[PDB]
Amino acid sequence: APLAQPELCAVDTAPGYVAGAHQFGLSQNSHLVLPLQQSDVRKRLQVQLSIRTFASSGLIYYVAHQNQMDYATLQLQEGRLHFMFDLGKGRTKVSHPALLSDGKWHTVKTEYIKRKAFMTVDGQESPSVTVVGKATTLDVERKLYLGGLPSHYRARNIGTITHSIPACIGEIMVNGQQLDKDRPLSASAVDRCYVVAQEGTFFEGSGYAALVKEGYKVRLDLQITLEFRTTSKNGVLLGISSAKVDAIGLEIVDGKVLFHVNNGAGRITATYQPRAARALCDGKWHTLQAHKSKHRIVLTVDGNSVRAEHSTSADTNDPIYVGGYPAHIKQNSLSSRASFRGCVRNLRLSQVQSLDLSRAFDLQGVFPHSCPGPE
C-alpha cells in the first residue's frame, strides 16, 4: 500500500515481424542449409542478397567441395565485407570499403565470373581482381550455408570468422535464381526479424543466459560495464556465485541499482537511487559501471558514482548468469530472482573483454543481438 499513486514506466511498442526474412546470430551456429539445383557455379558464381546488421563480424554464406579443396565465402570483419574463393590451386580475395553495421538495409552482390571477381554494395561496384591460380572451376557440393554453419562442421582455410552473423537476411539469389529460403534442407536456431531494431540483446522476462561454463574467477579486481534499457522496475542483470559464500551480483530492485559483493566476510552493498522512481524504466539507454578492487566497491550509473569500503578476494569459479537464473542455481550476492525484461548492449569485463551472449551454453527467453523498437 503506497503513500503516493504508483509511478508508471514508459511503454514498449511492439514493431511486429518482417515477412520472408530470417535473423541469424542468435547462437554461434544459427544457419539455414539451402539446396542448389539449377545453378552451375563452376565458371560463374553471382550472389545477391539484402542484409541489415549492427554486428562487427560473422559468416554470411559458404559453399565448398566435400574435401574442402574448393570453396567460396562472404564474411563480415570489423564491420566490412570480404569475399574469397579457391578454385583448387590458389585463393582470390576481394574487399569492399562500405561500412555495413548501421542497422539499415543494404543490397550486396558478390561475383566470380570467368577470370575476374568483384563486389557491389548498394550499387557501388569495387574494382575487379584477377582470379588466382591455374585451376579453372569452382567445384563444390550442391548446398549453400546461409548465415552460419552447423555445429558439427569444421570449415578449413577461411580464417576464424566461422561463427553465425548477427543479422537479418532477406531474399537471396544465385546466378539469377531466387532460392526458396522457406524450404531448407536443415537448419538450427533461426528466428524472425523485428520490422524495426536497435543494437542490443532482447530479454523477454522469462529466463536467462549463462556464459563461461568452465568457470569465471572474480578474485580481487574486476570492472563490469554495460548499457541497459527497460520498462520494468525489477530485474536481475548479472551474477557470478560459488555454491558457498563468495559471490558478486548486479540487479535492479524497485527502480534502484544494487551491486553486491561478498569476499567471505559478509555482503557489501553499493546502492544507486535516482531522483525519480521511474527514471531508470523510461525505455532509454543508461550506462552502468561497477568496479571491484582490493577493499573497494564502486557503482556508477549515468555518471553518478556510489561506493563502499577484511578478505578481499571473491573466490568464484562459476558461470556468469545474465538477466536472471534458474531456481536450482545459488546466487549468494543477489536478493532478487526476477528475470530482466528489456535490452542489454556492450557488456564487458575489465585489459578489457566483451561478452558475446550468442556463445551462451544455456539460453532461455533471451535473443542475443536482436532487440526490438527504434532507438
Contact set with Cl ion (CB under 5 A):
311, 313
**Which residues in this chain contact Mg ion in the complex, by CB under 5 A?**
70, 87-88, 135, 137, 139, 246, 264, 315
User: Looking at beta carbons only, is 88 or 365 nearer to Mg ion?
Assistant: 88
Here the cell at position 374 is: 527504434
Q: Of Cl ion, Mg ion, none, which one does residue 137 interact with (CB within 5 to 8 Å by kind)?
A: Mg ion
Cβ at position 311, least distance to Mg ion in Å: 6
Cβ at position 332, least distance to Cl ion in Å: 16
Q: Of Mg ion, Cl ion, none, which one does residue 135 interact with (CB within 5 to 8 Å by kind)?
A: Mg ion
| The Cα angle at residue 119 between residues 56 and 44, in degrees rounded to 5 | 125
Cβ at position 168, least distance to Mg ion in Å: 33
Q: Of Cl ion, Mg ion, none, which one does residue 157 interact with (CB within 5 to 8 Å by kind)?
A: none
Task: Give the span between the Cα atoms of 340 and 22, in whole angstroms.
Answer: 25
Task: Give the span between the Cα atoms of 96 and 98, in whole angstroms.
Answer: 6
Q: Is 48 helix (H, G, I), strand (E, B) or coil?
A: strand
What type of residue sits at position 328?
H
User: Looking at beta carbons only, is 269 or 313 nearer to Cl ion?
Assistant: 313
Cβ at position 316, least distance to Mg ion in Å: 9
Q: Of Mg ion, Cl ion, none, which one does residue 88 interact with (CB within 5 to 8 Å by kind)?
A: Mg ion
User: Looking at beta carbons only, is 134 or 152 nearer to Mg ion?
Assistant: 134
User: Looking at beta carbons only, is 56 or 311 nearer to Cl ion?
Assistant: 311
Task: Give the span between the Cα atoms of 325 and 319, in whole angstroms.
Answer: 11
User: Looking at beta carbons only, is 120 or 313 nearer to Cl ion?
Assistant: 313
Distances in Å between the alpha carbon of 83 and those of 58, 112, 240, 370?
Answer: 12, 10, 41, 25
Q: Of Cl ion, Mg ion, none, which one does residue 274 interact with (CB within 5 to 8 Å by kind)?
A: none
Cβ at position 131, least distance to Mg ion in Å: 11
User: Looking at beta carbons only, is 221 or 315 nearer to Mg ion?
Assistant: 315
DSSP 333-358: T-S--PBPEEEEEEEEE---EE--GG
Here the cell at position 212 is: 563461461
User: Looking at beta carbons only, is 273 or 313 nearer to Cl ion?
Assistant: 313
Residue 8: CB atoms within 10 A of its CB come to 9
Q: Of Mg ion, Cl ion, none, which one does residue 84 interact with (CB within 5 to 8 Å by kind)?
A: none
Strand partners, 186: 33
Task: Give the span between the Cα atoms of 22 and 184, in whole angstroms.
Answer: 12
Cβ at position 264, least distance to Mg ion in Å: 4
User: Looking at beta carbons only, is 177 or 311 nearer to Cl ion?
Assistant: 311
Cβ at position 315, least distance to Cl ion in Å: 7
Cβ at position 218, least distance to Cl ion in Å: 12
Half-sphere exposure of 9 (CA within 13 A, CB side): 19
Q: Is 281 helix (H, G, I), strand (E, B) or coil?
A: helix
Q: State the virtual CA torsion across 99, 103, 108, 110 in degrees, nearest 10.
A: 60
- Please return the burial class of 317, using the count of CB atoms within 10 Å of its CB with bins 0-12, 13-18 and 19+: middle
User: Looking at beta carbons only, is 138 or 297 nearer to Cl ion?
Assistant: 297
Task: Give the span between the Cα atoms of 111 and 74, in whole angstroms.
Answer: 11
Cβ at position 249, least distance to Cl ion in Å: 19
**Of 310, 107, 323, whose CA–CA distance to 205 is shortest?**
323
Q: Of Mg ion, Cl ion, none, which one does residue 362 interact with (CB within 5 to 8 Å by kind)?
A: none
